[PDB]
Design a protein around this motif. Structure first.
Motif, PDB file in Angstrom:
ATOM      1  N   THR A   9       5.154   5.301  -8.956  1.00  0.00           N
ATOM      2  CA  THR A   9       4.156   5.210  -7.889  1.00  0.00           C
ATOM      3  C   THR A   9       3.859   3.745  -7.546  1.00  0.00           C
ATOM      4  O   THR A   9       2.785   3.206  -7.806  1.00  0.00           O
ATOM      5  N   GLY A  10       4.879   3.097  -7.003  1.00  0.00           N
ATOM      6  CA  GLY A  10       4.715   1.750  -6.500  1.00  0.00           C
ATOM      7  C   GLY A  10       4.913   0.664  -7.533  1.00  0.00           C
ATOM      8  O   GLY A  10       5.914  -0.056  -7.493  1.00  0.00           O
ATOM      9  N   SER A  36       6.928  10.829  -6.388  1.00  0.00           N
ATOM     10  CA  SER A  36       5.631  10.166  -6.398  1.00  0.00           C
ATOM     11  C   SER A  36       5.247   9.632  -5.025  1.00  0.00           C
ATOM     12  O   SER A  36       4.086   9.267  -4.819  1.00  0.00           O
ATOM     13  N   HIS A  40       2.440   9.284  -0.060  1.00  0.00           N
ATOM     14  CA  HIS A  40       2.708   7.914   0.360  1.00  0.00           C
ATOM     15  C   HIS A  40       3.485   7.874   1.665  1.00  0.00           C
ATOM     16  O   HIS A  40       3.318   6.939   2.452  1.00  0.00           O
ATOM     17  N   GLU A  42       3.009  10.001   4.160  1.00  0.00           N
ATOM     18  CA  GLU A  42       1.984  10.167   5.189  1.00  0.00           C
ATOM     19  C   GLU A  42       1.190   8.883   5.395  1.00  0.00           C
ATOM     20  O   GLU A  42       0.935   8.465   6.538  1.00  0.00           O
ATOM     21  N   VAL A  43       0.795   8.248   4.289  1.00  0.00           N
ATOM     22  CA  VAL A  43       0.011   7.017   4.361  1.00  0.00           C
ATOM     23  C   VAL A  43       0.805   5.922   5.058  1.00  0.00           C
ATOM     24  O   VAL A  43       0.264   5.163   5.868  1.00  0.00           O
ATOM     25  N   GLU A  46       1.094   6.636   8.987  1.00  0.00           N
ATOM     26  CA  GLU A  46       0.033   5.978   9.741  1.00  0.00           C
ATOM     27  C   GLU A  46      -0.388   4.638   9.144  1.00  0.00           C
ATOM     28  O   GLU A  46      -1.538   4.226   9.313  1.00  0.00           O
ATOM     29  N   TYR A  47       0.522   3.953   8.453  1.00  0.00           N
ATOM     30  CA  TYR A  47       0.372   2.545   8.107  1.00  0.00           C
ATOM     31  C   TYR A  47       1.318   1.663   8.906  1.00  0.00           C
ATOM     32  O   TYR A  47       0.979   0.514   9.208  1.00  0.00           O
ATOM     33  N   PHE A  54       2.676  -2.657   1.912  1.00  0.00           N
ATOM     34  CA  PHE A  54       1.673  -1.678   1.501  1.00  0.00           C
ATOM     35  C   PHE A  54       1.330  -1.813   0.026  1.00  0.00           C
ATOM     36  O   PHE A  54       0.152  -1.792  -0.347  1.00  0.00           O
ATOM     37  N   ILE A  55       2.344  -1.940  -0.835  1.00  0.00           N
ATOM     38  CA  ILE A  55       2.094  -2.050  -2.264  1.00  0.00           C
ATOM     39  C   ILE A  55       1.810  -3.477  -2.682  1.00  0.00           C
ATOM     40  O   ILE A  55       1.416  -3.712  -3.831  1.00  0.00           O
ATOM     41  N   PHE A  88       5.282  14.418  -8.328  1.00  0.00           N
ATOM     42  CA  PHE A  88       3.989  14.825  -7.794  1.00  0.00           C
ATOM     43  C   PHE A  88       4.057  15.393  -6.378  1.00  0.00           C
ATOM     44  O   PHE A  88       3.005  15.716  -5.811  1.00  0.00           O
TER      45      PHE A  88
END
Ligand SMILES: Nc1nc2cc[nH]c2c(=O)[nH]1
Lengths: 324, 381
Positions: A9-10, A36, A40, A42-43, A46-47, A54-55, A88
């Motif tokens: 996760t990043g 994971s 992310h 989706e985020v 719209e990022y 992002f990370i 996940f």
RNA sequence: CCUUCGAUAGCUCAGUUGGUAGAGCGGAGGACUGUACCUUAGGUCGCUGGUUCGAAUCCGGCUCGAAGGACCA
């Protein structure tokens, strides 16, 4: 050869950005388990400006792999129009176009295509499996040629077939002809000699202008055997397993010890003499033993630093070994 | 007449707030100051460099916690606590007592000491004042504390506790031969009443111990009687000796206690913002890409965002727990720096009005204890 | 074209001797005021149709499958 920075996760497990800056030898490409990265996607949809910003790691390239090798999967659960991702998120009906939207949001440098046919974990069923694994690559190449930044993103191919000789041979032969960046070896989880000479023939059948990848293989002697059998890149989920069970690796790259034995609580020496990681630089093995006795969250961090430093130093050593 | 460890060049006009320097054998600490507890800091996984990067100067330790394991003799063999958890600055060791561990896990109390136990059934021992000061000599810290009788709790038991604390201070002073290598503090007890507390304060101001400390308050504490006790205690003591306080971590508690003259104050996943506590488990700003506080100089704000740690909070739990806890400690350090810098500028009534209106919106929404104590010391909101 | 089996929280599964749902990995709310965490939500159990008081559990078929002979190599 080469290694991928194993990130859950990043970020790395038990490591923050400053503590990742403490680690020496982190590669410029970071593996991302696509499982994971379900929400992310989706985020990042719209990022709209990439996952590196992002990370907080935009200076590094990125790779997306579908399978987290800590939880690889059963003898067979994958479909032939979709790949379930263990982690996940991303079980039911992940299309090739869903992967297209995911890689558009993530904007990775490289990305792993989908797959089917995990039976290596006969002839005609493997023919159907390999034909479907070519259908995946055809769909990816058709939907990849559209967008410019996605045209800047690179497809990595998948080799399938199982334990069968001729079917995996023809999988390599008929998957090579597509205009693809690189290749993956799948269904090689532990190890037997059957999969070993299957690997030896199949990587001989593929052209030498493309990288080879593999999943589910990270223990160092299987890494050496796959290097001499034709694999270029590997994952890094083995030092995570070393730290999860509370052990520390000790083998000199240029095996492991469980600190819960009572014999090390008097020594003032670090876990590995001359190791340049943070834990061996400041702490002592008695404190690691002590805090493993009381089961707090700090020795996981210190050990996890030490395992990454040792394991990526091992990859640095095997890169320099074939260089000479 | 021992030399004073505390010096002061700061005097507020409308209030009695103070700001000064404490000399300790590993450095100088600016009063007022906040102290992260070493047990929870080791539990939440912040390393040495991440805690030192925020600028902290005092951490914390316990006599019980190192006495059980890895053993006082192993710690004494290695000169333990400064070369063990690798804290380069000074540290204050709490002697322990009737804390959250109590008679469900403690044992019988006799005159010689208080008996301590463990989940290890063979690890039951008797912690005597000579035993406690021997262990705390083995720890090799910078501020040692005499063995306390903590109460939450009223009645003659508190009177027995304060008298017994006087006797145990006598035993502790007569026990160890390190008045110069380490500093011994005296816990002022008294519970929630002021008369036995007042004669207790008189009793160890007869004693020449270099430090005084208010104890036994947090856990069941009402803040009005809390600040009244702090005010009467700080009025009683001479101004050249520090006043340690226990169990103060909230922002308004801290700053108003600075206004009364204090100098010492001392599961993850919640950040600290200038508007208060911001629990980062919230999905309400899971899409927020701004830092936690645009003015916070902690690395978490300047490198990361809120959405990223919202994603990371439970997935890879340890890294995000590290991020949140280092942000909290950085916020507390910056708040102390702001309060001290405002007091040195003789702006403290204006500053308390300013941040009062900032993190409370208006003076009408503030708690009554902060406004009452600031009006009593002489500051209008 | 035919034979057998799977589709369950966001993810892996149990549950299939039929009882509408749990465990873990992931989420959310609070407590952190001198430390040997608590509480809580989410899943039309792939679709279609049927038996039954009642399905995730059983099945005809469809989709996505997996194994095997493959209507085709
Ligand atoms: N030093 C000290 N610590 C604690 C922790 C709870 N109560 C007390 C106290 O009265 N004194």
């Amino acid at each position: 050869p080469g290694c991928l920075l194993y990130t859950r996760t990043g970020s790395a497990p038990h490591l923050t950005h400053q503590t990742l800056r403490n680690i020496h030898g982190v590669p410029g490409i970071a593996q991302l388990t696509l499982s994971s990265l379900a929400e992310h996607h989706e985020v990042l949809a719209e990022y709209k400006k990439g996952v590196g910003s992002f990370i907080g790691m935009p200076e590094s390239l990125f790779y997306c792999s579908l399978h987290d090798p800590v939880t690889p999967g059963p003898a067979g659960y994958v479909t032939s129009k979709s790949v379930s991702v263990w982690g996940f998120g991303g079980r039911v009906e992940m299309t090739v176009s869903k992967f297209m939207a995911i890689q558009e949001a993530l904007q990775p440098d490289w990305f792993q295509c989908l797959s089917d046919g995990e039976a290596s974990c006969s002839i005609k069923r493997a023919r159907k499996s390999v034909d479907r694994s070519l259908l995946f690559l055809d769909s990816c190449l058709r939907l990849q040629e559209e967008s410019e930044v996605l045209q800047k993103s690179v497809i990595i191919g998948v080799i399938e077939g199982g334990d069968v000789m001729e079917e995996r041979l023809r999988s390599a032969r008929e998957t090579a002809k597509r205009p693809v960046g690189g290749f993956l070896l799948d269904g090689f989880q532990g190890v037997t000699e059957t999969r070993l000479h299957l690997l030896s023939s199949v990587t001989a059948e593929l052209p030498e202008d493309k990288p080879r990848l593999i999943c589910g293989v990270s223990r160092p002697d299987e890494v050496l055997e796959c290097i001499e059998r034709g694999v270029d890149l590997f994952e890094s989920f083995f030092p995570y397993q070393v730290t999860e069970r509370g052990c520390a690796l000790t083998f000199t790259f240029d095996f492991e010890i469980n600190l819960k034995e009572k014999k090390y609580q008097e020594d003032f020496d670090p876990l590995v003499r001359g190791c340049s990681c943070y834990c061996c630089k400041n702490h002592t093995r008695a404190y690691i033993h002590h805090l493993l006795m009381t089961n707090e969250l700090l020795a996981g961090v210190l050990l996890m630093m030490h395992n990454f430093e040792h394991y990526f130093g091992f990859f640095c050593s095997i890169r320099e070994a074939l260089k000479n | 007449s021992a030399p004073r460890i505390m010096r002061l060049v700061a005097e507020c006009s409308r209030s009695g707030a103070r700001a000064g320097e404490l000399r300790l054998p590993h450095g100088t600490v600016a009063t007022p100051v906040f102290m992260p507890v070493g047990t929870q800091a080791t539990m939440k996984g912040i390393t040495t460099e991440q805690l030192d990067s925020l600028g902290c100067r005092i951490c914390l330790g316990n006599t019980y916690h190192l006495g059980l394991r890895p053993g006082p003799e192993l710690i004494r063999k290695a000169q333990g606590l400064h070369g063990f958890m690798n804290w380069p600055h000074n540290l204050l060791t709490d002697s322990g007592g009737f804390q959250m561990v109590s008679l469900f896990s403690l044992s019988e109390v006799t005159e010689e000491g208080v008996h301590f136990r463990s989940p290890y059934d063979g690890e039951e021992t008797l912690l005597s004042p000579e035993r406690s000061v021997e262990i705390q000599n083995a720890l090799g810290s910078d501020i040692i504390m005499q063995l306390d009788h903590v109460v939450s709790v009223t009645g003659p038991l508190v009177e027995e506790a304060m008298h017994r604390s006087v006797r145990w201070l006598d035993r502790c002073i007569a026990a160890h031969k390190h008045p110069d290598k380490q500093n011994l503090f005296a816990i002022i007890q008294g519970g929630l009443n002021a008369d036995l507390r007042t004669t207790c304060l008189k009793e160890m101001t007869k004693r020449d111990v270099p430090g005084f400390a208010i104890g036994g308050l947090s856990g069941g504490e009402s803040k009005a009687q809390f600040w009244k006790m702090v005010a009467l205690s700080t009025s009683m003591l001479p101004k050249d000796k520090p006043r340690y306080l226990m169990g103060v971590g909230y922002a308004t508690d801290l700053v108003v206690c600075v206004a009364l003259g204090c100098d010492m104050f001392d599961r993850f996943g919640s950040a600290l913002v200038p508007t208060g506590n911001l629990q980062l488990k919230k999905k309400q700003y899971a899409k927020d890409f701004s830092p936690i506080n645009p003015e916070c100089p902690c690395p978490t704000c300047q490198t990361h965002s809120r959405a990223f740690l919202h994603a990371l909070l439970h997935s890879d739990n340890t890294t995000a727990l590290h991020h949140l806890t280092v942000h909290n400690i950085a916020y507390q350090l910056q708040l102390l720096s702001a309060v001290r810098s405002s007091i040195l500028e003789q702006r403290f009534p204006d500053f308390v009005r300013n941040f009062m209106r900032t993190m409370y919106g208006d003076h009408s929404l503030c708690p009554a204890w902060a406004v009452e104590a600031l009006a009593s010391v002489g500051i209008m909101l």
